[PDB]
Each structure stands twice: as C-alpha cells, then as structure tokens.
Amino acid sequence: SGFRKMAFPSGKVEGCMVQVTCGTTTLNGLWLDDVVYCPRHVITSEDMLNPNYEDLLIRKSNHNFLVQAGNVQLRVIGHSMQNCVLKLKVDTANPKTPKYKFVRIQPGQTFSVLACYNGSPSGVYQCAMRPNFTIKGSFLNGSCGSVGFNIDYDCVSFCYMHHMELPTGVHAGTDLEGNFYGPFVQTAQAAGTDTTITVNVLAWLYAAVINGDRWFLNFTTTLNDFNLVAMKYNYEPLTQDHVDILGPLSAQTGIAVLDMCASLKELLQNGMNGRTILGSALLEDEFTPFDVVRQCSGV
Amino acid sequence: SGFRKMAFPSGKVEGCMVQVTCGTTTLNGLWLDDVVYCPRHVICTSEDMLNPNYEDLLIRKSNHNFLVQAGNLRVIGHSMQNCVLKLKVDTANPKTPKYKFVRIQPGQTFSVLACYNGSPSGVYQCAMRPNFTIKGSFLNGSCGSVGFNIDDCVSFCYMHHMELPTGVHAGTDLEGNFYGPFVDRQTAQAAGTDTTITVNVLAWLYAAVINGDRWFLNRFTTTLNDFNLVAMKYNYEPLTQDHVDILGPLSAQTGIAVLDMCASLKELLQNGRTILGSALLEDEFTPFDVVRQCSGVT
Ligand SMILES: *C(=O)c1ncc(Br)cc1OCc1ccc(Cl)c([N+](=O)[O-])c1
C-alpha cells in the first residue's frame, strides 16, 4: 500500500564519488575503473564569461589536478577532454566500481540523483528529465559532478552529470560522455517551454486506481481527440508506443488506456475541484510506467 | 537552487539488510554486530496472526528454525525484546556502521530503505505523523525495513511491522516498542485523528522564501496564542515556544520573524497559487531538514 516518489538505493554510486580540485575550484567527480569523470569547467570566474576550454586545458598539467577519494589521494597520470566532461586517468582502479553503463535517456524518463559536495554524499532523490531537457533538482554551489543514475538489477546506468544552475532556478547537465541535454553550453540561456509528460501522468493515474483512489474515473475517447485536448493544455502528444508501454498497467487494472485518457481529458478541462489524488492536488508527471510497475510489484 | 524531499544516502544501511526466514514466513532483518533484528511476527503462521501468544510461539521454536540470509549465517541464539526478535549469529557484520537506536518524536523525519527478501528496493523520506503512523510505500514482504537518520553514525529509529487497512503503516523502534497504540496482531486497530505538523509547515515556508517564493508573505503580526486559535480549527498541531525557538536559525537567515511567518500561515489556512511547486502545505520537512538541504550538509 501507499505510493511514494522513490529513489534507487544509492550505495553503489556512493562508492564512486570523489573530490576533484583544480586551482581553487573544487567539485565532485565519478571514479570508475582508473578514470575520474567530472565537469570540465573545474578548470576561473573570469573564464566563466567566455572560456576557450581547449586553450585553458592546454595550460594545465597532471599535477594541477587533486583527486581525493575520502582520505586517500589519487595521483593523476593523464587528462583528456571529451565534449564537456574531463576524464582524469588515475594510477588506481576503484575497487568499488560496480557493473555500470553510460546511457543517454530520453525526455520524460526518471532517474535518481545523489547530490554531493566535496566528494561526500548529502542526499538522494528521484526526478525526471523534463521535455525541455532541464531537471528541477536541488543543487547548491559545489554540487556539480553529482550524477543521476538508474539501477537495472546490479547494473548502474549513469545518465546525468550536473553542470549548471540556470537563472530560472532549474538545472542542466550532460550525459557521461559530455553531451549536454538540450541546447545548453555563464550567459543568458533560455530553456524551451516546458510541457507535461502525458504518459507519466496516465501511469500515475493507474497507480492511484491500484491504491484505491478512483473518484476521477468516468466516457471514452480516441487517441486523436485526446491529443487535441493535450495540445491545448501543454501536454506532450500521446503516441501508440506510449499506449503499448501502458499495456501491463491496463491489464492489471482492467481499465483501457483510452478510457483512462478520457478521465484525464476531463481532469484537464474541469480541474480537480479541490480533490486530491494520492495526496497531491496537482497532476504528477515524474513517474514512468516502469516506475509504477516497479513500486507496485516491489522489484 | 530547488527544494526536494531528500532521503539520506543509504549505503550504510544496505550493508545491514538480510533476509530472515522462519517456516514459510520470510521478511527483512537488520544485521549489526552479531545480532539480527527482525519483527517478531516472523514466527507466526496465518492462523496465529489473529491472536498470537508470542511467548508460547517462540518457546516452540529453536535456533535452527531460523534461516538468516546475507546475500548468498548460523543462528546461535534467539531472544524476544518487546516486539522485535534478536537473533544472535556466529558472525559479526563486517559492514556494521557506527550506529545508535533512537526513539523519535512525532513530527520528526527519517529515510526509509524499503526492502524485500533482504534486498533494497528504494529509499524515500517520510515523517512520523502525530498519530504515530507513517504514510509510506510498503507492500507485503517489506516488514523488517528500517527508517533512519544519519548524523558517519546511523541513527536507526523505525522498523516496519504492519500495513493498516487505512493504507498507512505502523512499526516499532529498534527496541521493539510500537509507535502509537498498535500491537502486532491482525485485528481492526484505529489510529488517532491525524493533525498537521505546524512547525514543519513553517519550516517549509522558510525554504520557499529562501528559494524565491515569497508571495504568501504579509505585514501582519500575531501572538503564539492567537495563531493557535486559528490552527486548532484547521486541525493543525499547536505551536509552542519550543517550536518558535527551533525556527530561530531560519528566522535569522531570512530576516522574517517567526510570528510574522505564523501570520502569513494564518492567511494560507483562512484563505487557501503554488508554493515550491506544491498546491498543498507540506508538513514533512523539519526545520533541521530545511537547513540541511539549503546549507548542503553532507
Ligand atoms: C557547480 O556545481 C559549481 N560548484 C562549485 C564551483 Br567553485 C563552481 C561550480 O560551477 C559554477 C557554474 C555555474 C554555471 C555555469 Cl553555466 C557554469 N559553467 O560555466 O559551466 C559553472
């Protein structure tokens, strides 16, 4: 019973968090095998306005990089820049390296973030890659290098590394190969208009029904008619593959996807009239259909 | 920037999670030093759950009736302390962190590492409600999962025991004493009237102001007494002077007096926009939680 925004257990990622210092800049890094991954902007405030990163790295040597893993000091024997991440080769392989992969997720997918400062964990929480490729996280100065991940049974899938806090107050970063999610690269950078992850909202309504919350159940509708309503309310268009992913939840609940779409159409056109769903007064869109299944089945 | 419901990093607790089996009942256990702690109802059959005589049931079981799984342990002793089983094992957990057993107060927060068959499944932050229930996510098989705070030292405060028909959850401290009026028996058990943790709501309003959301801020004032008259009507817990003292540091950081924040809350209750992306008033961040997240304590 119950339904919570649930993060993956973070023990496997905690063992890979180290502290990287260049000059006076200190941030977090990720230590897997004999390589430490960290944001490349670790290399001044004057540089923050228009850095020629290739030119700034040139002036750097291996001993200019201080990688600390708890109390032990790692010696850097090589450095290279891949897109927007630094890769520092160290003389020791991380003995706590889990089975891992680097994955680039799609907008709408969820992951857990282990927020870190000075290489030490401070907290873990679940969030989602918004359609405009930002995330609404909790990141203070010093959190850069914190990574987002999914755990697919024993294997850690690193998908995010924190790089920046936009003036909007939302956050942007890269995958573990250094490619920013979205158009982001210290200048004014506008994120796109954010929209609601429709397939996630529908999955969350399935979670509600499973947990006894059914007052919003109604009508039917077509994929097209619902999408016309979804476009008006800044909702992502619902495709047939979204309907297929919602299959298992439809079978378990006995509620056809297009029937749930009609209930959501009503919820969008009429609002919630002060009622709550799973203790929320808003429509929640940061649970994937896989998230709902995992929590309700207990994987 | 930002404010999230944030759980403690769970690595230290993961290393203490084992799987405990007695007969056909399997649930989670906590392995610290040479002792495995688990709910004592692991020894009950389904017929026993309606009126178990735990002493009579434990008497008929021996050490070898307990199969303790630590990933892929021999039990050399068993004892019953209130509602928890204490299984002495021949091996001390090499991953035992520095730990303490603590009994928290209503309104305090902790992280829950939800587990099934001794394997972690997820971590989330919740609060001990005033009626001593928690609004968690617990399926059958989750019993033995523990709630904790981290101060290098892990403070274990909760062990899950039962899912009420209400859909809320109840458990004990690590000494076996239930939070609330609940017993480990399958009968209808009523939780109290739940109330809103007023001091937590005020802390969350400070987090909002810290993060740029200030529209709810007024110029009115109030006394502790007048505010409590309003709070009583809306099923809010009464705010004492100790609660005003706890909110001191947040007042200093924001420059907003505690009683001024209480006056702003008077509006929100009497008149009902979003605050930190929420359309409801959140009461599961303590003032210590807000400081920890906004100052970045690792
Ligand atoms: C960010 O995590 C961080 N921590 C510590 C220090 Br010192 C500097 C940090 O990055 C600041 C920052 C903010 C915004 C942008 Cl866009 C950049 N950047 O040029 O990448 C850096």
Ligand SMILES: *C(=O)c1ncc(Br)cc1OCc1ccc(Cl)c([N+](=O)[O-])c1
């Ligand atoms: C609970 O975590 C659990 N998991 C697996 C099995 Br098999 C049995 C479990 O406990 C069921 C349960 C439910 C409610 C109550 Cl009140 C009790 N109890 O008598 O303590 C047990």
